[PDB]
Each structure stands twice: as structure tokens, then as C-alpha cells.
Amino acid sequence: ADRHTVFWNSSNPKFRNEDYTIHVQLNDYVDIICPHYESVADAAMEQYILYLVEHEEYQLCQPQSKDQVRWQCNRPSAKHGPEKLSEKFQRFTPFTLGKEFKEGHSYYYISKPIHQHEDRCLRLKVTVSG
Amino acid sequence: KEVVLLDFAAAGGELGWLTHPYGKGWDLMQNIMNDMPIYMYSVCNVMSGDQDNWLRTNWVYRGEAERIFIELKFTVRDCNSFPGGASSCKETFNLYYAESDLDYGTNFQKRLFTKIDTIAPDEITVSSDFEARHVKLNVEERSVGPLTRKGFYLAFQDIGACVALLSVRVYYKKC
Ligand SMILES: *[C@@H]1O[C@H](CO)[C@@H](O[C@@H]2O[C@H](CO)[C@@H](O[C@H]3O[C@H](CO)[C@@H](O)[C@H](O)[C@@H]3O)[C@H](O)[C@H]2NC(C)=O)[C@H](O)[C@H]1NC(C)=O
Numbered sequence: 508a509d510r511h512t513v514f515w516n517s518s519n520p521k522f523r524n525e526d527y528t529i530h531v532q533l534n535d536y537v538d539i540i541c542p543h544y545e546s547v548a549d550a551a552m553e554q555y556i557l558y559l560v561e562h563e564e565y566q567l568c569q570p571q572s573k574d575q576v577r578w579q580c581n582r583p584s585a586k587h588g589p590e591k592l593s594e595k596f597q598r599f600t601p602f603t604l605g606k607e608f609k610e611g612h613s614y615y616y617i618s619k620p621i622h623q624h625e626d627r628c629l630r631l632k633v634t635v636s637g
Numbered sequence: 638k639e640v641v642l643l644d645f646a647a648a649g650g651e652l653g654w655l656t657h658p659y660g661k662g663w664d665l666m667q668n669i670m671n672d673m674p675i676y677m678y679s680v681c682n683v684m685s686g687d688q689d690n691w692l693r694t695n696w697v698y699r700g701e702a703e704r705i706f707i708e709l710k711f712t713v714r715d716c717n718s719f720p721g722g723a724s725s726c727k728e729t730f731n732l733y734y735a736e737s738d739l740d741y742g743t744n745f746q747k748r749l750f751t752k753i754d755t756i757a758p759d760e761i762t763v764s765s766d767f768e769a770r771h772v773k774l775n776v777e778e779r780s781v782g783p784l785t786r787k788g789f790y791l792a793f794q795d796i797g798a799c800v801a802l803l804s805v806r807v808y809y810k811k812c
Pocket residue numbers: 514515516517518519520541542543544
């Protein structure tokens with residue numbers, strides 16, 4: 508009713524069109540859920556760096572800099588459950604390294620695999636309505 | 638030597654502190670600082686008038702502790718830096734505590750809490766600090782004593798400020 512779930516993995520069919528976009532309101536949460544396993548081989552477990560980027564980096568599906576690193580899916584078999592990035596679409600942050608989100612704007616996530624095949628570009632468009 | 642009873646930053650975001658009112662005030666936020674994954678409780682209800690938001694730590698077993706020392710690290714945003722910015726913007730928050738024999742779990746009654754002090758930033762985060770990605774991290778310490786009951790909670794009350802709490806460290810000194 509309030510939070511949106513995205514399964515960030517290369518088997519998620521929603522990424523196939525590369526038009527994957529979800530619509531949120533201010534103060535909605537997006538829960539990006541990292542690949543998670545409890546047995547395939549360690550090397551087969553999907554791992555990603557998530558970036559939060561501007562439109563152009565989204566078009567290229569490539570990060571511009573370290574500053575854009577949002578989170579890391581580098582715990583594919585954590586016992587405590589899947590690793591999870593919970594982004595609240597606030598208008599204002601007290602934290603100077605975080606992002607602010609505005610009504611009528613769109614925001615963009617991309618990933619890169621951690622030392623693995625990039626078969627397909629994984630990206631997400633989040634549009635704030637209002 | 639210092640014996641640590643609570644260390645938020647060390648817990649890797651697994652702590653799950655109670656907030657009140659339910660799902661309205663403080664939120665657990667996540668970020669990258671110094672190329673490391675970090676967590677913080679933050680609140681920024683500066684446009685909404687009268688705010689009364691509580692973050693309560695989990696119950697801390699006292700043991701042999703008599704005087705505890707509480708180390709807070711946090712940021713606070715310049716009330717001037719809000720496009721709107723109602724005269725309901727504050728630049729402080731309050732630190733409370735309560736002693737208990739048992740863990741009350743999901744029960745939270747504010748009036749059981751005693752105010753320790755108002756917490757104010759030495760360094761205010763200004764709008765230019767955003768494009769410069771400059772984190773001005775305040776450090777504040779308080780102590781309460783003598784503790785007498787089997788355990789205690791700390792709580793943080795926001796009254797309409799834009800705050801991010803990055804660290805909460807409680808310890809006593811042995812000898
Ligand atoms: C990769 O993304 C997949 C989604 O495209 C994800 O599959 C999803 O797995 C979750 C939880 O494991 C399922 O959620 C449901 O789980 C059970 C099913 O009855 C119930 O508790 C709930 O109804 C709950 O919503 C999804 O149904 C499932 N979706 C699909 C299409 O299979 C994978 O788990 C992700 N893979 C990895 C490696 O993490």
C-alpha cells in the first residue's frame with residue numbers, strides 16, 4: 508500500500524524490456540531486493556553494485572563516478588535474509604550524501620555485476636507522480 | 638577502561654529500534670560514506686508543524702554499570718536552507734532515558750521517560766554542503782547516574798528538526 512518491491516536479478520522478466528519503470532508518490536519506499544540463495548556454487552550467485560544516476564548514465568547504462576554508488580549486493584547468501592536497499596522518496600534529507608526526490612521528476616538506477624557476466628543491462632526508472 | 642553496552646554503527650543496521658508514532662517519524666536510511674555501507678535513523682518533517690517523533694533503543698542490560706556515558710554522532714540541517722521552511726523548523730532534538738526491570742517490548746509510553754538534555758549541533762549543515770558532498774558530523778556526549786534498575790532504554794525525541802543520527806554508543810568505565 509506504501510512500498511514497492513523490485514527483485515534485482517537477471518531472471519526477473521521485468522528487466523527484459525529495459526523500459527522497466529515504477530510509479531511512486533512522495534514518501535513511498537522502493538525496496539530493491541538483492542539476489543539471495545539458501546545451494547548453487549558461490550561463483551554462480553549473482554552480485555551487483557547498484558548506482559543511482561542521472562538520465563544520461565541510465566541511457567548508457569554506465570555509472571559516471573564512485574559518488575553514484577548507492578548500495579552493494581555483495582551478500583548473496585547472508586543467513587539473515589536477502590540484502591536490501593530501502594530508498595524512501597523524501598523531498599528533503601538531513602544527510603548530505605543522500606538524494607532528494609521531487610514530484611513530477613524521474614530517477615534512475617543501474618547496476619554492474621561484481622566480476623560477472625553482464626548479459627543484459629539492468630536499469631530501473633522511478634517516476635514520482637503528483 | 639570502557640565497557641561498551643550499545644553501539645549502533647557497529648550493528649550493521651540489524652538493530653530494529655522502535656519508532657513512534659507507528660511508521661511516521663524516524664526512518665532507517667542507508668548510505669555509502671568513506672566507501673563503506675552505513676545506516677542512520679533520520680527525520681526531516683520541517684514543513685508539517687507540531688512534530689513529536691520518538692526513536693527508542695532496544696533494552697540495555699545494565700549489569701554492573703552505575704554511570705553510563707552516551708556518545709551521539711549526528712548531522713542537523715540549516716533551517717534557512719528550506720525553499721518553504723515554516724517557522725516550525727527546529728535545530729535541536731531531545732535525549733531521554735528510562736530505567737526498567739523488564740523489557741516492555743513493543744510498549745512505548747513517553748511519559749515514563751526522563752529528559753537528559755537538549756542536543757544541539759556545533760556544526761550546521763548548509764545548502765552549499767550538498768553540492769560539495771561535505772558531511773559535518775557533530776559529536777555530543779552526556780552521562781546519567783546512578784542507575785539502579787536491571788536495565789534501561791534511551792529515546793530520542795524529534796520536535797521538527799532535520800536530523801540524521803549516525804552513531805549511538807553507550808558505555809561505562811570500570812574501576
Ligand atoms: C529473482 O527475482 C525473482 C522475481 O522475478 C524472485 O522470485 C520471487 O521470489 C519471491 C520470494 O522468494 C516470491 O515471493 C513470494 O514467495 C512466496 C510464494 O508463495 C510467498 O511467501 C509470497 O507470496 C511471496 O510474495 C516471488 O513469487 C518470486 N517470483 C517469481 C517470478 O518467481 C527470485 O527469488 C530472485 N532470485 C534470486 C536468486 O534472488
